[PDB]
Amino acid sequence: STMIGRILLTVVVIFRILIVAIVGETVYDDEQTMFVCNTLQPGCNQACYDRAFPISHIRYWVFQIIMVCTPSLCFITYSVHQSGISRFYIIQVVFRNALEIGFLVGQYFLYGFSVPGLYECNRYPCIKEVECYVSRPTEKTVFLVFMFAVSGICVVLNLAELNHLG
Amino acid sequence: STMIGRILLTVVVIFRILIVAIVGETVYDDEQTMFVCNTLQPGCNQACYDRAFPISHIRYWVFQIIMVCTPSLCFITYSVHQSGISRFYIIQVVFRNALEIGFLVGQYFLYGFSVPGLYECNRYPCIKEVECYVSRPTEKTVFLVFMFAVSGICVVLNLAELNHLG
Amino acid sequence: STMIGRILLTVVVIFRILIVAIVGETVYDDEQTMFVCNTLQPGCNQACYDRAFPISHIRYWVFQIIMVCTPSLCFITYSVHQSGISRFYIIQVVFRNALEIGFLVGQYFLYGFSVPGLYECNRYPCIKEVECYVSRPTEKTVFLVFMFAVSGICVVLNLAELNHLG
Amino acid sequence: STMIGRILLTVVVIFRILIVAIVGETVYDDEQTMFVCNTLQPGCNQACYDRAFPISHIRYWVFQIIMVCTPSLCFITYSVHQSGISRFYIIQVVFRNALEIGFLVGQYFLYGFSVPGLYECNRYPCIKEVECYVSRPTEKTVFLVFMFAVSGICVVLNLAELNHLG
Amino acid sequence: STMIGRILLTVVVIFRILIVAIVGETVYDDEQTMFVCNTLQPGCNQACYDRAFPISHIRYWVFQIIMVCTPSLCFITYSVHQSGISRFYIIQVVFRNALEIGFLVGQYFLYGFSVPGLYECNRYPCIKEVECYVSRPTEKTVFLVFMFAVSGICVVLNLAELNHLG
Amino acid sequence: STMIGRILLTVVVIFRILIVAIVGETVYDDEQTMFVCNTLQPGCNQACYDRAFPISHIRYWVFQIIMVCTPSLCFITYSVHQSGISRFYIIQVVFRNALEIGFLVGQYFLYGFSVPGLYECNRYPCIKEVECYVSRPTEKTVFLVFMFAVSGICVVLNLAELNHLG
Amino acid sequence: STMIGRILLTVVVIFRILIVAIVGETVYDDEQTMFVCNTLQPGCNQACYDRAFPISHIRYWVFQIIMVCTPSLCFITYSVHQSGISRFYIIQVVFRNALEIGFLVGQYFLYGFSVPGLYECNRYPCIKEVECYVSRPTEKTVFLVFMFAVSGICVVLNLAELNHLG
Amino acid sequence: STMIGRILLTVVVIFRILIVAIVGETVYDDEQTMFVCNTLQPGCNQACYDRAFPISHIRYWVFQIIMVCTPSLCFITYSVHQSGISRFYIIQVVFRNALEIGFLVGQYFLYGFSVPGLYECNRYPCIKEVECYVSRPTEKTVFLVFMFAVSGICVVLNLAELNHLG
Amino acid sequence: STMIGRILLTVVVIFRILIVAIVGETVYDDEQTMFVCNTLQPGCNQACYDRAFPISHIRYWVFQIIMVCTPSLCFITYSVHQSGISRFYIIQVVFRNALEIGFLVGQYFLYGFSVPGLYECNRYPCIKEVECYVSRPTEKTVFLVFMFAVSGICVVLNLAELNHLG
Amino acid sequence: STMIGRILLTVVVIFRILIVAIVGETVYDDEQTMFVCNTLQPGCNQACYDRAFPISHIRYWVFQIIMVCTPSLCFITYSVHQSGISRFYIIQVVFRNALEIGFLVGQYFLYGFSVPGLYECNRYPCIKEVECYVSRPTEKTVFLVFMFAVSGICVVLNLAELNHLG
Amino acid sequence: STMIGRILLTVVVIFRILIVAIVGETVYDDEQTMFVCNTLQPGCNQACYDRAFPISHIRYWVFQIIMVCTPSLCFITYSVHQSGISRFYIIQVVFRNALEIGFLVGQYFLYGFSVPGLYECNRYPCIKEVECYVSRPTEKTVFLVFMFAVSGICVVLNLAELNHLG
Amino acid sequence: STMIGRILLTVVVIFRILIVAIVGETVYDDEQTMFVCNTLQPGCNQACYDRAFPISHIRYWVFQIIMVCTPSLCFITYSVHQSGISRFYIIQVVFRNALEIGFLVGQYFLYGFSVPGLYECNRYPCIKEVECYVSRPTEKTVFLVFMFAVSGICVVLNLAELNHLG
């Protein structure tokens, strides 16, 4: 039972990396070029876009992907320099669990579960409140849901292994 | 008879991957830049494009290509870790068959058999119904038909092998 | 006499692949951005471009290049799995001949021998007949002629070898 | 205690290089295309952009990354040519410390701790003072803070090792 | 004396290839985007550009570079298949000489020795004669002269070796 | 004393190549797109840009980098073919010195020590004298100074080694 | 009682003429210049304006004013030529009554009682139905009501006098 | 019976003059400013407008009005100079009849009975045939019909008087 | 004392008429051409202008001027037809008083005492609330105050005369 | 016979004045606003219009009309001051004849008999020769012919009277 | 001496009225259409024009002309009604003097002695201070000076007559 | 001889007034709308037009016409009030002579004898010197010459009469 867990964890990790690397960068290419607001004021588009999307999804996902694989690099470097291993194993497993749970919660609190098509903006220099229109909301919603599902699976597997070792 | 089946399956898979990888990404490059609607309303182009093409063909095809090759990766990882194999063989064959049939049916229900040149749009903020015009419909229709034919061939071969093993 | 034939065939094939790969993709880059028609109607440019150039030359050439090298891949895979070979040799030679002749005839019937500088278009929504102007006709004509010559040489060599074996 | 220091230093260095290389170049892509000032004067945008951002952040970071790894290259070349090593070791450690502290102080004095959204410009040919608007200030602020934190960690580790050797 | 000739020939060939490959493709990038004519007629820019520059310099140079190295590929393939060699050596030397002289003469007759800054155009649909303006004439003139000098050196060396063998 | 000279020369050469290769090509990307002159005359921008910047800095630097490493290639090819070496060593050292001094003097006479922000242009078809505005002058000035310093260091080291051998 | 009727009739007639002559012509001056429809189709504005306002109010009112005073001119010309008068008097009174009632009914059936601010148009070449926006609807509504009231008063007075004579 | 004929003729003449003078000049004010054709060719609007409307209606009507009152001026001048009168009376009546019939027939042959909303134009420099759109067709049709009716009434009355005198 | 009252009343009336007639019509000429709102929505300018200024000041003043002089016309017509006069005198004085007081109160309730420079508009099709900018507010405020003062003087004089007669 | 000559001369003169005064000024209103040339050069329209039409037809006709009636004014002033008359009569008749013949010949030599629709212009700052397009050529041709006919009639009558007096 | 004073006063008054009436209204026609400010802000032109020119010169001059002739109208009406005259004469002379002096002082305090070509504006919604440019400053300065001189002459003459009567 | 002088003077004066009044005002209508300069600077057109044409010709001519007829008005007013006359006659003749000579000299010194088609302008805010283009130079030159000739004739006649009286 615990034999297949490692295989499934590795396959899920590789799948997530490949999906993020091959396709993600071209959905978000024209995010700001195709953002439009109903106004004649110079500088309102910049402020309203910056308020609507403080950090892009793809930047967050790349950062998370790189950060969640650091314990393995530390373990490999330690083993290479050596050339209490179980203590290092346990510590790295715990750290991986904590990092993954933290990142999942942060994603939920940053983005939610959908991308709406309209936005209401009231930042200077825009006069009172204006309405702005988003590009490709449906595809971005699908991406959000898919990423959340994959991260949940990863968390479940890590908890399973942690409870297996005891 | 069953000897040539594996060779033909491998050749078809490689051919599909190469065709999708080398040429597909540049037909769909200007999909939204060359989309135009007859109107003066800001934000109508975004809504009508999003309603006409919820998910691009190329995204769907890349996802399908990556997803239909996961059982082989699982088998290879299992064999590497080992260094009832027939049980794994049978299970992976069954899973491949199911995944391919599901993806083919999903493609048919998502896209149909052609891409029309005109589109009729009635989404907010567009007033009543408007007419929009598509880029490169004929080439996209040819691509659709070619992909459907290749996927059908793959399904036929997988069913043949499944019935061969028994 | 038959010794040099194989060398010349290989050199011609490699030359064709290199020529298509290095230079072809940048002549056709701006095909639709620099296409213009004399009109004020929205959507007329899309329809007239789609009617004038249903499939781009470069797409056809890439498809042909990939398709005409499949018998070699099948032969290599068969030999690798084995690790009546002459029957496979004869069959693959025949198939290569048929594929090359078919593709040459298809090219002739699709494109002809030149690219004109003006086009007359009468497709909806354009009112009556309009005149449109093409980008880089002379270079494209040169490319067409060069490709036809190379394909003819390849056909001649394949027929020579087929008659040599008997 | 001193065993883990080298591992952590190497991991931090690799992390910084990867973060700068993979994501940084695409945040700053449209820095000058999306810079706008409220005026009708030709040439005012160029002058005001040049005054606001004399050197881009990414150029400075690439230069610093390349410059802080030169002592290692010198050491490797010396060892290769040889094929008082401790004297070279001490000297290169000292030089690395000095370079890192200098670069950190220079960053602080060049950029500060945030990127504001508005800029006030009074350079010829602009008449009196004008107001200009910046692109993506929040993301750039986050990047600044992250880079400062990483560089501080590196400085702390280098000082720790220097005091360890004595 | 004949020892250094081969070394100088190889170095010159590699230098020419590197110069053409690294820098040439970006001087000619905006050739047609920055071409302008003084007129209000739609379609006049296309016709006048096509008449002024039938084939780009870079296309011609790439074709020549690829074509002048085919005898070496034939010789290598012959030697590999073998695993009267002097007859092949002599024949390939003669063919190289002929190809290089032909290409040099063709370049001279196609392009001349300079690129002027103004062009006078009288092609339909332009009314009578119009004046058009070229991009980056000085750099292109420098490139032309440099390429001519290199090709002349190559021709001289090939003739030297041909006379050396006798 | 003469041991470290070779190491420092190699490190400086590699540093210069890396700096030119990684960052230089993107500072000069928009040189002509963001060049503007105060006028209504068609064709004046082309003439004034061509007069202000006959050859780009990056082209000159790439050419110099490639040209100053040819003696090493000649030496390596000679050694490979051999498989009076000191005569070749001395000759190549002398040639390297001459080439580097010539290129440094040429740079000084071509470009000077700074890039001004305004330019005064009086070339046909511009009427009398006009004023034009440059993009990113400060960064280009910094680049100029840095390159001059590096080249001076290289010249000093080469002269040192030449005097060392005697 | 019948003495004041003639005075009131004359005063009302003069008042109507003055009101129409002095102010009416400048409310309707920009009727078609400030008419706008939401579309990109050439020729749609003309068709939709022509369908919304077949005849301008001011043209109708001028025609009516001129036509309702013809019997007086006929009577004056008859009297001048003479230089059964009661028969002419009765006949002209009857004709005036009939003309005024006919014109009032025609106005009601042509225009109604208000001018709306939006219009829905479905005439060729407009595609399907479009929305258009009117200029100065409130003032035109006030004018309509005022004119109707005045005409009603005139009709009442004419009927009163007709019944008075018997 | 013949007494009322003169009165009715005078009243009709005055009515026609007043109608033409007060209202006609402002319907045709924007005839060429609001004329539009679907094309990008300079000079096509001028040619197509000139071909569609060689002479404006209002010019023709003013000319006719002035020309049909010349016999009265001649008669008055003759009487003033005198200060066979019946011969002059008869001659002027005949001339008036002839002029009025000629002008009515000319109007019918020049303009017809309606103004269409679309026009098809094939004059140089327009390429092939184009479609153009007219301003205020309905009002102009009403004007045409009204003028024809009035002129017919005038002709009938003149013939009546001519037959009365005998 | 009562002798000068009539003279002052006549002079004030003539002064008001002259002031309104000579200068008023050219202050309000460009009221709608120079009205601007900050928005990209078609049709918002029309709605917001119509809501801000339902009836122009000049139209109201012309109507009032014409309406307040009708009793004099009635009196003159009565006297002419006659060719209890005191009863008519008293009645016309009373009617003039009532009309003037009513018009003054109506002006106060319609317009107030100033014209502001900014307007806030929330009418369909404008999205939420927008800001619009007025032309020549100061001059229009001066006009308003001047007209109010003149009308007040007229009312005072009419009341004085009414109380004088008793 | 000579009695009717004076009447016909007066009627013709009055007719010419009325025709020129009422209609002529509005055909030529938009002469320069609707003049267009195919070019991008600033200032070419002004030069080409000034070269095509040095003096407008209407200016010439007004000048001629005023100048040909001066002898009558001189005669009237002489008679008024008096309050050899035949000598003045003869002299004024001769002067009128001379002035009319001179003006007719000048018209013929200035304008010819038609107005063409296209014009070829080669004046600075236009580059080489350009093509320009005229407004309302047919109506202007009709006007030219009509004016020539009227002037010819006037000349004939004046010569008739001159020969009558003897 | 006092005889010529009245004649000169009348001539000066008539001259001033004629000069103001015939030419003044067309210098100020395009005051706001040709007013321009260097900015991209909507609504800044309106505010800055309103602040620079609160009341137009021509409005002030028309008001003054009408107001300074009221005493004569009062005197004429008094004389007509009469059909102590010296008391009225003296009173009207005094009132004329006071009105003229007041208007001259008001002109000086409102406008000064020149119209500058540049204006500096700092009113909302303009950001900080902007620069605006005036139309026809020199002609307006000449007009100002001429009007001041004429008014001064009038004041001098009125004072002369007042002192003459005593 | 002196009898005809008065008649010719009156006729010339009336002719000049009529010519200036009927035609002059419409040649200069579009003087500033059709003035263009080759530049991108806001405010340069205003400054350059104001420098080229400080006072319009028509304003100067109207002022001169009004000013040269004041002595006659003074004489008429004196005669009317009277109802040494020769002293007034002589004085007014002298004053007329002086005024006419002064105005002619002023015209010559202000305008010269022709209007050129190009203008060179160097006023702030224009950068250095720019070129501007004038509207209708030939017609304005003709007008200048005609006016000068008429004024010269008037001066000659006035001097003749002055010498006649003695």
XYZ file of N, CA, C and O in Angstrom, chain L residues 88-151:
256
model
N -14.813 126.800 -44.599
C -15.039 125.391 -44.303
C -14.745 124.523 -45.519
O -14.148 123.447 -45.396
N -15.155 124.980 -46.704
C -14.888 124.226 -47.926
C -13.389 124.006 -48.120
O -12.929 122.871 -48.323
N -12.611 125.086 -48.040
C -11.166 124.988 -48.240
C -10.547 124.067 -47.194
O -9.710 123.206 -47.507
N -10.945 124.239 -45.931
C -10.344 123.456 -44.856
C -10.626 121.973 -45.059
O -9.736 121.127 -44.895
N -11.863 121.633 -45.426
C -12.207 120.227 -45.611
C -11.477 119.631 -46.809
O -11.057 118.467 -46.766
N -11.279 120.415 -47.872
C -10.521 119.913 -49.018
C -9.086 119.595 -48.605
O -8.537 118.531 -48.935
N -8.462 120.514 -47.864
C -7.086 120.301 -47.421
C -6.997 119.048 -46.555
O -6.083 118.222 -46.708
N -7.937 118.901 -45.620
C -7.900 117.754 -44.722
C -8.065 116.449 -45.491
O -7.390 115.453 -45.196
N -8.961 116.432 -46.481
C -9.140 115.230 -47.290
C -7.849 114.859 -48.010
O -7.439 113.688 -48.020
N -7.192 115.850 -48.616
C -5.925 115.583 -49.294
C -4.913 114.958 -48.340
O -4.288 113.930 -48.651
N -4.730 115.579 -47.172
C -3.736 115.076 -46.231
C -4.055 113.650 -45.805
O -3.165 112.787 -45.771
N -5.324 113.379 -45.483
C -5.692 112.045 -45.026
C -5.425 111.003 -46.101
O -4.892 109.921 -45.813
N -5.768 111.314 -47.354
C -5.597 110.328 -48.414
C -4.126 110.032 -48.666
O -3.736 108.863 -48.812
N -3.283 111.069 -48.696
C -1.858 110.827 -48.919
C -1.274 110.006 -47.776
O -0.501 109.059 -47.998
N -1.630 110.353 -46.536
C -1.122 109.598 -45.406
C -1.507 108.134 -45.474
O -0.676 107.251 -45.238
N -2.770 107.854 -45.808
C -3.216 106.466 -45.863
C -2.516 105.700 -46.981
O -2.166 104.527 -46.806
N -2.307 106.334 -48.138
C -1.612 105.644 -49.224
C -0.184 105.284 -48.823
O 0.276 104.152 -49.043
N 0.533 106.236 -48.224
C 1.905 105.954 -47.806
C 1.920 104.848 -46.757
O 2.780 103.954 -46.782
N 0.983 104.899 -45.806
C 0.919 103.856 -44.799
C 0.675 102.485 -45.397
O 1.271 101.498 -44.967
N -0.213 102.404 -46.391
C -0.440 101.129 -47.064
C 0.843 100.613 -47.696
O 1.207 99.439 -47.534
N 1.551 101.484 -48.421
C 2.784 101.042 -49.065
C 3.779 100.522 -48.039
O 4.413 99.482 -48.248
N 3.933 101.230 -46.918
C 4.919 100.817 -45.924
C 4.473 99.598 -45.126
O 5.326 98.894 -44.576
N 3.169 99.328 -45.056
C 2.699 98.154 -44.330
C 2.769 96.880 -45.160
O 3.179 95.834 -44.644
N 2.387 96.930 -46.439
C 2.132 95.696 -47.177
C 3.031 95.465 -48.381
O 3.265 94.307 -48.731
N 3.545 96.509 -49.023
C 4.323 96.314 -50.231
C 3.486 96.080 -51.472
O 2.425 96.693 -51.627
N 3.944 95.193 -52.362
C 3.304 95.008 -53.656
C 2.931 93.568 -53.988
O 2.419 93.328 -55.086
N 3.160 92.608 -53.095
C 2.809 91.230 -53.402
C 2.677 90.438 -52.111
O 3.136 90.862 -51.049
N 2.044 89.273 -52.227
C 1.890 88.329 -51.122
C 2.613 87.041 -51.502
O 2.175 86.344 -52.427
N 3.710 86.681 -50.840
C 4.409 85.441 -51.193
C 3.692 84.203 -50.674
O 2.882 84.254 -49.748
N 4.006 83.071 -51.311
C 3.360 81.813 -50.982
C 3.958 81.076 -49.802
O 3.270 80.247 -49.199
N 5.219 81.341 -49.469
C 5.893 80.696 -48.350
C 6.278 81.736 -47.307
O 6.493 82.908 -47.633
N 6.356 81.307 -46.046
C 6.774 82.190 -44.964
C 7.737 81.449 -44.046
O 7.555 80.259 -43.781
N 8.758 82.154 -43.562
C 9.752 81.599 -42.648
C 9.570 82.223 -41.269
O 9.651 83.446 -41.124
N 9.339 81.380 -40.261
C 8.897 81.811 -38.941
C 9.867 81.325 -37.872
O 10.289 80.166 -37.889
N 10.219 82.211 -36.942
C 11.154 81.880 -35.867
C 10.706 82.479 -34.532
O 11.499 83.068 -33.795
N 9.427 82.328 -34.192
C 8.887 82.855 -32.945
C 8.584 81.727 -31.966
O 8.164 80.637 -32.366
N 8.801 81.998 -30.682
C 8.461 81.043 -29.638
C 6.966 80.729 -29.698
O 6.155 81.633 -29.932
N 6.553 79.464 -29.478
C 7.328 78.294 -29.042
C 7.914 77.453 -30.163
O 8.368 76.341 -29.921
N 7.929 77.948 -31.396
C 8.481 77.169 -32.493
C 9.985 77.009 -32.308
O 10.687 77.955 -31.943
N 10.477 75.798 -32.552
C 11.895 75.503 -32.379
C 12.657 75.921 -33.630
O 12.332 75.490 -34.743
N 13.682 76.752 -33.446
C 14.423 77.341 -34.555
C 13.473 77.911 -35.604
O 12.492 78.572 -35.250
N 13.740 77.672 -36.886
C 12.965 78.262 -37.968
C 12.119 77.197 -38.656
O 12.580 76.076 -38.887
N 10.879 77.561 -38.986
C 9.929 76.674 -39.644
C 9.384 77.361 -40.891
O 9.512 78.572 -41.073
N 8.755 76.557 -41.746
C 8.182 77.004 -43.009
C 6.667 76.842 -42.978
O 6.161 75.794 -42.561
N 5.949 77.877 -43.410
C 4.494 77.883 -43.422
C 3.998 78.282 -44.807
O 4.712 78.920 -45.585
N 2.741 77.929 -45.085
C 2.162 78.008 -46.421
C 0.869 78.810 -46.399
O 0.025 78.622 -45.518
N 0.719 79.692 -47.383
C -0.335 80.694 -47.398
C -1.455 80.248 -48.330
O -1.264 79.447 -49.248
N -2.650 80.780 -48.082
C -3.846 80.491 -48.864
C -4.147 81.633 -49.829
O -4.123 82.804 -49.436
N -4.430 81.289 -51.083
C -4.862 82.245 -52.099
C -3.925 83.447 -52.257
O -4.360 84.597 -52.135
N -2.637 83.223 -52.529
C -1.737 84.382 -52.677
C -1.988 85.206 -53.934
O -1.866 86.437 -53.896
N -2.344 84.565 -55.051
C -2.466 85.284 -56.320
C -3.634 86.268 -56.297
O -3.507 87.420 -56.734
N -4.790 85.819 -55.802
C -5.956 86.693 -55.733
C -5.689 87.884 -54.824
O -6.095 89.015 -55.122
N -5.010 87.647 -53.704
C -4.697 88.727 -52.778
C -3.719 89.718 -53.399
O -3.827 90.930 -53.175
N -2.772 89.227 -54.202
C -1.878 90.131 -54.921
C -2.656 91.006 -55.900
O -2.416 92.222 -55.998
N -3.591 90.402 -56.637
C -4.410 91.171 -57.574
C -5.194 92.247 -56.831
O -5.284 93.399 -57.279
N -5.788 91.879 -55.694
C -6.539 92.843 -54.893
C -5.651 94.002 -54.455
O -6.050 95.172 -54.528
N -4.451 93.689 -53.962
C -3.528 94.734 -53.531
C -3.263 95.720 -54.660
O -3.354 96.943 -54.475
N -2.929 95.201 -55.844
C -2.579 96.085 -56.953
C -3.773 96.948 -57.349
O -3.633 98.154 -57.606
N -4.962 96.347 -57.415
C -6.156 97.096 -57.801
C -6.432 98.234 -56.821
O -6.720 99.373 -57.226
N -6.342 97.946 -55.521
C -6.604 98.976 -54.523
C -5.587 100.104 -54.623
O -5.942 101.287 -54.513
N -4.314 99.757 -54.824
C -3.299 100.796 -54.964
C -3.597 101.696 -56.156
O -3.482 102.925 -56.062
N -3.988 101.105 -57.288
C -4.286 101.914 -58.466
C -5.440 102.876 -58.198
O -5.375 104.065 -58.544
N -6.514 102.373 -57.580
C -7.670 103.231 -57.316
C -7.285 104.384 -56.396
O -7.668 105.543 -56.624
N -6.533 104.088 -55.333
C -6.148 105.142 -54.399
C -5.271 106.186 -55.082
O -5.399 107.389 -54.818
